[model samples]
Target: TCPFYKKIPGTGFTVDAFQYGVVEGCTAYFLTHFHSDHYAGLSKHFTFPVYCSEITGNLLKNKLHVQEQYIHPLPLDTECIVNGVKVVLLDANHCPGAVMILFYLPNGTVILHTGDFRADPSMERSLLADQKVHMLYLDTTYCSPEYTFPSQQEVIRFAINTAFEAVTLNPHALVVCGTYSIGKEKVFLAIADVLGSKVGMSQEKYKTLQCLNIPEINSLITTDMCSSLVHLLPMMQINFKGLQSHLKKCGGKYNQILAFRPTGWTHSNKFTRIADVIPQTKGNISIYGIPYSEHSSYLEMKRFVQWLKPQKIIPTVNVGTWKSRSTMEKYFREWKLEAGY
Candidate 1:
């Protein structure tokens, strides 16, 4: 946890957790969003009282199986104090529950910590249209000039189209794909709608869909009643070998099995590939490689860090992106920020 004003040497922070572990005997104000990287280990270990947007809170509860009591919901772009630290949540247009937090110190220092965000001028315009931000802790995950992505809407369209194509090719296929149950409900709905009355579902996945009240809005086969239907797996649940075996046995020979896996399969540790654990499995396995990144691109991340012009840039997620600090500094030192801050 970084302190409010100054950055520490190497805790990957602007504040030293050991020196300023807590302000007023309390752990530094905790603020968060629904981004995967930002909240990855939160549910697994951290048990501190956390503050999150209502959207983000609901996401954590439904997706992570965490309690709602742990979440204190705050309004969007509003300011409040958790433990004497003034915190504000800003709209991050990259994802539905993504947020950028601005922490204002009592000493008049304002620091903005950005979650995974895209610097689309349209997004920047949307944010600035509401309030003026002073300092920024950028999501410089891609400041190396090697990553790029298309527009958000275009990427979503590509993903949806790809899913539709995969489903159409194998109507009776037991498709186990990855998707956010609550965060990306629209994607699930799109798959259901395209499946029409032909596609079936696994008992477990069908129950999940039912809990979302999808049948009320769209006609779908429920898990409780999928005794004869094919078994479809949610992207998150396909990692377990036991789950995959159950689904394969449930899906008879008449119905095939397929899924659209993300490009991150190569980096995954467990059941990374469709054939990794299930060697006999063979079906239409598609990988969505479009620039569907949730984080900023190389150039955009550099621009964001340059906009801040901080003395040092620290990464929170992984060290593989550590070189971003120098890469961004090199670019900005040459041209400087257009505003010359």
Candidate 2:
């Protein structure tokens, strides 16, 4: 796979493009978060100095075992100069350590790189929103018109409501949730804590959550299966066949399985009014596809673009082909109308 070819336009720095190894003239490397997609090529053998927020730096250190001396942890909302560019890290509101990077190029060009984010109200007050960004690099995962969905809190409540009803009816049902290295912690953690059952995970995940340092996280995670009724697993394992295998591994303690398969792709115009849990059933196994997205909706991205009104726009995601990139440009053109001629 080819790496993301855009590198802040005027600097030798690369953001979230580590898959191809040593990028020529890449004096410093930057990571937005600890997501597998963002930190794909990084490993124990990496030698380049990586700059990120302290929280992201901790995940790189603890999750990936990246060396300390090669890591540069920056503080939030403060200006730090590296390679003659002023850098500020603002919370991306996507995941635990995710951030939107602001680069002050040597000649006064303000470049904003959104490394996978959810544009919430808090980010509307972000410093980036106040001034015009010269070059805007964005996450275009859900840039299409159909990708709009509810806020994070709404989807979280829906999952909790669905699970509480399902489990109250079937007290022995196993509450399972699809997850990754660092996303969807809020949804799963809320369900486990409110229901008063500690969540269970693999040894790897247990270590990752502890590194998050959330106040409620300390007493909510464990590796022991019986001690925790709710189970956290990779998105791949939440499928029908996968749930059955996991149930068998639990020694037949739970009779039914209730799995929450979370993603941003389940949105539909028909369902916004009748918006409720979408479920499929087979032999006491139920998989509810929850649109618990970490990425901004199409409408959110529109507001961000219209609000910031950057000088130039570049798609960081969904830029694989002429088709994807060309289609995505439609939004920016319309957004320009809302902001300018």
Candidate 3:
């Protein structure tokens, strides 16, 4: 937190040097979530007393392989103290290890950072009880109306349904789903569980799962771990030709292939081009690009500012856009958040 303010990528910056004691002293800058963008840089640089909720710390330590002695694990919807700062972890239903962090500084300044969270019921409940909260560093990733996408559950279900249908229709094809190196791991697991014992992960998928530190996924037809099924890849490598060869050689003969995208990142047309480019031999490699976005939508952003009634609403991401940032400013003005901080 800088005393003087500057614009940043996702949140505003504090240009003043007065906000140093927290990050500089023995106290650590608690990590709210474990998403790559959120904690990746922090893990690399700082190794102080980083506090996170139990699940978040678990996922961060296990998945990211970060080693820190100050991994303070708190529970959800609960409050704890570290270095005289009152910290609370709130539910953020965006990813497997997401949370909203409320830091009540010793100086009586309360800052709530909503780290890439959605405006679902759980989020609402978590926010309802916290009255008189001061500043909010919001997750305004989708502060534009055009960024609408389907729910995570819906997207996962669509992928599972499409994959199963495609595999059954042409049982001699190989599936290769591409996801973010860090993102979409859980979604992949969900799809695998849906695919079941009849279908095993390609060798590459299995290796990918293993590299992600999800070792229990090593076994196909995994027992007591539906939430953690892994995909095996061919030759234990990560290349297109190797992947294709793995699919071709599965069960001694590639019958049908069905792979799901890790995340839905498409161009303006709102659909990926797999429909036009998939091989006929793929036996229907239906690329289900359902809308499973992790960020909050523009309407949700507006609602957050409206409900919080902040003194000044400073837009961050894509703020220079004509309609996007200005529209949010309009909402802030309407809500009288343009007054002063």
- In candidate 2, stretches whose alpha carbon ends up further than 4 angstroms from where it belongs are 1-5, 267-274
Q: List the residue pairs that clash in candidate 2.
A: none
How much RMSD separates candidate 1 from the native structure? 7.2
As a whole number from 0 to 100, the lDDT of residue 266 in candidate 3 is 41
Best by TM-score: 2
Error of 3 at 114 (Å): 0.6
Better of 1 and 3 by lDDT: 3
Candidate 1 off by > 4 Å? 1-24, 34-48, 59-70, 94-96, 126-134, 163-174, 179-187, 197-247, 264-291, 302-324, 332-340
Candidate 3 minimal-lDDT segment of 10 residues: 7-16
lDDT of 3 at 32: 54
lDDT of each: 0.50, 0.83, 0.52
* Number of clashes recorded per candidate: 7, 0, 26
Model 2, residue 83: what's the lDDT?
A: 88
Write model 1 residue lDDT over 16-36, tens digit each, in one string: 122333334444324445545
Error of 2 at 305 (Å): 0.6
Ordered from best to worst TM-score, the candidate numbers read: 2, 3, 1
